[PDB]
Design a protein around this ligand. Structure first.
Ligand SMILES: Nc1ncnc2c1ncn2[C@@H]1O[C@H](COP(=O)(O)OP(=O)(O)OC[C@H]2O[C@@H](O)[C@H](O)[C@@H]2O)[C@@H](O)[C@H]1O
Ligand SMILES: Nc1ncnc2c1ncn2[C@@H]1O[C@H](COP(=O)(O)OP(=O)(O)OC[C@H]2O[C@@H](O)[C@H](O)[C@@H]2O)[C@@H](O)[C@H]1O
Ligand SMILES: Nc1ncnc2c1ncn2[C@@H]1O[C@H](COP(=O)(O)OP(=O)(O)OC[C@H]2O[C@@H](O)[C@H](O)[C@@H]2O)[C@@H](O)[C@H]1O
Ligand SMILES: Nc1ncnc2c1ncn2[C@@H]1O[C@H](COP(=O)(O)OP(=O)(O)OC[C@H]2O[C@@H](O)[C@H](O)[C@@H]2O)[C@@H](O)[C@H]1O
Ligand SMILES: Nc1ccn([C@@H]2O[C@H](COP(=O)(O)OP(=O)(O)O[C@H]3OC[C@@H](O)[C@H](O)[C@H]3O)[C@@H](O)[C@H]2O)c(=O)n1
Ligand SMILES: Nc1ccn([C@@H]2O[C@H](COP(=O)(O)OP(=O)(O)O[C@H]3OC[C@@H](O)[C@H](O)[C@H]3O)[C@@H](O)[C@H]2O)c(=O)n1
Lengths: 350, 352, 352, 350
């Protein structure tokens, strides 16, 4: 499914390469022989996987704002990629509330900017627009969303993603009609609850837990019974890649929306998770706070990807966790993270 | 019904007051005793109703860009309105195809700005967000859309309205939540009108203006899609709907803080051809038309919610409406007093 | 439009011809020159229009049960009709609650029988399956249902129609497939009408009959649900729709072999109260009403498909309709010649 | 999830007990201590699991037609069950075409008959109405149906099931409103592609294959690439039981529709299946015919059951198959099938 030779030598432009996912993706792709260029603001964190693995060496990197159409246009045109991965985004919900303007301009205008650039420039066979599992109108039900369902979003962040999804659709219809020449294939990819090593995001369950353990402090669990479709970073990333390959060779036929996610079977509680974590950590412990600990959850239906891309996730919760834990320790102990990160990909690739 | 007394003295801020809808609204509103402050770019066209009726002299007209947050916020801040009508937009289809970015920035970020501005300023009781009949994902089918259907849009303009709809519901949810109404005091409604036609519209590529211009200049009008259908309606119709909701939001914010369609009666949802044929007839004196980028074929709106829930109904019929547009255009032509004609239409409507 | 010439000489088999709808249909049909054979149980009520207009003497009326397959099949077989209207049913709500089994057997198996009979007999060109406006899952909302919405039904009657709808589409799919049209030659449509009201209906618990009976006997009519809404329409309205489709199915079976709603214009979908108030007025002479098992509150039908696709539109308004029912009832009362009055209404409608 | 003690001593009335599923269910339930009564026509086949395991000994059995309301009413009233499983049905699609009247009267009128009886009689806490995965309006898509989707069915059999589903709904609304006393809890259960030992149905993939092998003849595979949500007979049956328990103790809250099915992950091709079969058989072989062998499939979304009943399937395709094969051999060799059948349940129960 993931063809190395395919990647070998491809001029790939990725927006938002300095962040978590962008860095894992850029790595992989370079690991594979692709000629990458990144366009983003400086690493969103400290530490930052981007830096930790010294990616500016392995790839061309442009620091810039998605909101500068011209600069953005320029940067791409100079490059002439053939493949584009769009991931620059203001990703926090929390923030989304304080900074709605920022969220929207970044998330919606940036998307518009990007597709319009791709449009004006020309010579792009494949664009993979990264949105979110939150783009969907939230019915607060037990069911996993299908790609044909309505967009929305309750908070600014989620809502911004539903808009980005509308944008990609209109761009596709207006400018890259599959039904017709331009040679541009455009897919919007949806996924969430992404976990792995290199995630220095603040107020994130995994990161937290790890910081906690690392600093020997015990963890306060706010809601033990909460369930999420937790998935290793590489899982969705593989979907994106494959999708990119398909868009490339097959075009139009895959120019559409696509959900990436774990098996329902693989859904664990926060409590379960922290427990495993603990065990996994060794050294590690946690506590239940005084808030309300309530007993449905947002999920995606992956039938279309399984079925039409033959895509399937590879690691089970436990494995992923351990791999997460192991990668953290390595880091902490001063191991070469580029290498370990590399093996991580390698392993997933088997 | 519209309440002239409710309007008296009200501080009303209207974005996009320089346009077709804006001008008619501002005129209506000032005529009712309201204190209106507009914020838009210079008149979209020439001629322009704004200019034609000298509205600038009957209101506080401020020239500015919706994309300039800071400037927008200030404008609002200094006036402290109690009511707001957000109508500024790049409202054209074919153009949106040519200028995608300006369309989205204007329509989308402009809405965000306006709503963020409303949030920061405070003491605003009612917010009426004007979107479009094009916000709905178009299934190209025989049925009028319901408020509960999915947002979308094929072209950048349609799609930008779809996004504007999403934006308002997220602001509503996160910041003007009916739950915490007492905490914010904000009523916010998204209003979706049909295809407004009336005397005083110079917009490019629109049907009636197109028609009026050709007729005027003893030329035949060029028809691109004779069998398309739109929810045709006198410009004053949805305006009445907008006004009514503002009234209701003023006192029962929580309750009417949602989406509303304002369109004609189903029988008024005719084809392009029908209109042009009628218009030819209405004009007379040689009038003729002639047959010639993705546009929707069918577009209808189901208005049972406003009918039942707001108890709002349309006043004029398509034919009556066409007749009135003609009369208006000609009067203008003969150099009649348009402010006076325009005032007359509002009054007649109020009587209808 | 209805085609009197198309009708002439046609062998038409009508199940449930003894009823209200049936009688009006049979009358219409024979009046057009058609050769009608009915198959139903004895008149549903007394009085009965069937009896009142002596239809039995103007057609081949056969008394039989839809649940008796063999008997039904035979009846059809011996007549070899070219057209079929399936209207036999236990059509009442409250009753269905009391008699669930008879309701389902009649409505469901009766449809199966009829369709299986049509299959075995052959040479039938058009089949018009009358279901009900109650076939749709009722979401209790402001919107008229579209042909493409889900079937359901809360009570046994509603639900039996939902099942009757499913049955016809499965027969269509499996046995009268548009694909193999040339192989079977069968056109089959499911028609969903509104709430028919007209002179000549004695059905139990129905509104207008209820009203007419009380008025008649200088008593007040007892109203159970004043604010409910139904798609009120003169009985001749949907009939026209049924007739029109049969015409079309006759020659373009494949093409019109689907579901169709036949209802009034949206403005005619008023409440119970409105009707009774109007009726009081129409009747006069002391007329009054008085306020008093699960029934739907709101029920409307979206008819854009028939409007656009069959080009069918309703002729009379609710008020006109109410007026005509009154006139009819009274004439009857004074001992006027009902066949003649009834013939007159059909003619007037044909003129409308 | 399946409580033995619960079952112990329950007066349970099952319609369609002589057939495949009815016999497995009746067994289990008796295995568990329930006092069962069956109401059905004579065994639909030869051999017949019903006979093979000598069920008339283990349970009360009434031979009768579902279409005789009175008799049916009588039979239940005499019994006073507290739990009712409704499974009498004309189950063949093939037949459904030749015998539409039969199918409908049986499938729809029988259902009406049954619910009305339950109604008139009284004293039934739980009714489990067995429909089919085919009750749904078939959208010919990749997605698994949700319980809230529209009913229909293309052929008479499928369509008959969509009607039965409408019937149960109306009965529930009209007569057993959850929202209100009567103490009747009514669930409609949907499932299909049910496989296992004891299935003597003609023109059924598994049965066939087994007959074939058994008679040393080689098998002709019409469509190798076809995919179905194949599941061991006991899988759905467990759902039914549990559902029954819930309806019983909790009532109304579970008075609704429910889908039972396998994990998507567990979807195999006919070819795959026959291969495994072969291997599994030993002795065994097959051939591809001359028809068209084409490359979406009807499936159900089981989120509601997983989530709200905590229900999950237990055996994987392979296992099920083997168990199928093993049970067949046992039979053939003259082993006591009641016993083996018994162990089958026992095993599933672990
Ligand atoms: N205005 C901007 N211009 C350019 N790049 C930007 C801008 N704002 C943010 N970015 C870049 O976007 C990335 C954000 O990365 P993270 O905070 O690590 O978030 P990540 O988990 O990578 O999220 C990427 C985005 O796509 C979805 O996968 C995800 O949910 C999120 O919304 C970084 O490359 C960051 O510099
Ligand atoms: N960036 C901008 N900043 C401020 N005002 C703007 C901007 N872009 C457009 N406007 C203002 O928007 C108005 C547009 O008016 P018209 O072109 O006449 O369009 P109209 O038919 O009045 O549309 C009014 C409103 O109703 C909706 O149907 C339509 O989308 C628009 O939102 C004018 O006052 C114009 O200056
Ligand atoms: N088992 C039966 N066998 C044969 N005919 C039957 C049977 N049950 C009822 N009928 C016939 O059905 C007809 C019912 O007529 P009405 O009670 O007057 O009802 P009407 O208002 O005419 O309904 C006609 C049709 O339109 C639908 O709205 C309604 O459900 C029915 O299908 C009568 O001719 C009656 O004898
Ligand atoms: N008219 C009838 N009256 C009574 N019982 C009947 C009647 N017709 C069929 N049955 C009984 O129904 C059962 C049919 O069993 P099978 O042919 O083995 O089919 P099975 O796989 O058990 O299917 C049961 C039914 O429910 C669903 O699970 C399934 O898809 C099928 O429609 C037997 O008990 C049979 O005697
Ligand atoms: N010469 C011409 C002109 C027009 N036409 C056809 O008439 C119809 C109406 O088009 P317009 O008047 O431009 O209105 P729009 O419906 O695009 O959007 C309008 O109504 C909805 C609002 O939201 C939007 O802002 C406003 O521009 C279309 O099918 C168009 O192709 C034709 O066939 N020949
Ligand atoms: N005294 C009375 C009588 C009636 N009503 C109300 O008037 C409405 C109309 O009821 P009915 O005339 O009985 O018509 P139905 O709509 O039940 O079905 C009818 O129309 C649809 C057809 O399919 C069906 O066969 C036919 O019976 C209901 O809300 C009823 O409760 C009231 O408030 N007081």
């Amino acid at each position: 499914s993931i063809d190395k030779n395919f990647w070998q030598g491809k001029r790939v432009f990725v927006t938002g390469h300095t962040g978590f996912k962008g860095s894992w993706l850029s790595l992989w792709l370079t690991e594979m022989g692709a000629i990458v260029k990144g366009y983003a603001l400086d690493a969103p964190t400290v530490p930052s996987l981007f830096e930790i693995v010294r990616l500016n060496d392995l790839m061309e990197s442009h620091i810039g704002d998605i909101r500068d159409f011209e600069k953005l246009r320029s940067s791409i045109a100079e490059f002439k990629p053939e493949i584009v991965f769009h991931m620059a985004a203001q990703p926090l919900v929390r923030l989304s509330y304080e900074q709605p303007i920022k969220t929207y301009s970044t998330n919606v205008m940036g998307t518009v900017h990007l597709l319009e650039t791709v449009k004006q420039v020309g010579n792009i066979k494949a664009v993979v627009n990264i949105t979110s599992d939150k783009c969907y109108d939230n019915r607060e039900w037990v069911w996993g969303y299908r790609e044909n369902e309505p967009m929305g979003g309750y908070d600014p962040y989620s809502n911004s993603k539903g808009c980005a999804e509308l944008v990609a659709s209109a761009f596709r219809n207006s400018f890259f009609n599959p039904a017709n020449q331009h040679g541009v294939g455009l897919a919007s990819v949806r996924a969430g609850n992404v976990i792995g090593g290199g995630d220095w995001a603040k107020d994130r369950l995994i990161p937290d837990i790890l910081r906690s353990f690392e600093n020997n402090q015990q963890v306060i669990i706010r809601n033990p019974y909460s369930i999420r479709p937790w998935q290793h970073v590489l899982e969705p990333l593989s979907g994106y890649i494959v999708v990119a390959q398909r868009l490339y060779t097959e075009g139009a036929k895959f120019s559409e929306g696509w959900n990436f996610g774990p098996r329902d079977e693989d859904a664990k509680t926060v409590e379960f998770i922290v427990d495993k974590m603990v065990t996994l950590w060794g050294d590690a412990s946690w506590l239940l706070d005084g808030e309300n600990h309530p007993h449905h959850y947002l999920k995606l239906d992956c039938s279309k990807a399984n079925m039409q891309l033959g895509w399937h996730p590879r690691w089970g919760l436990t494995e992923t966790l351990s791999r997460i834990v192991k990668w953290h320790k390595a880091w902490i102990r001063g191991e070469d993270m580029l290498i370990c990160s590399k093996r991580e990909i390698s392993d997933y690739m088997s």
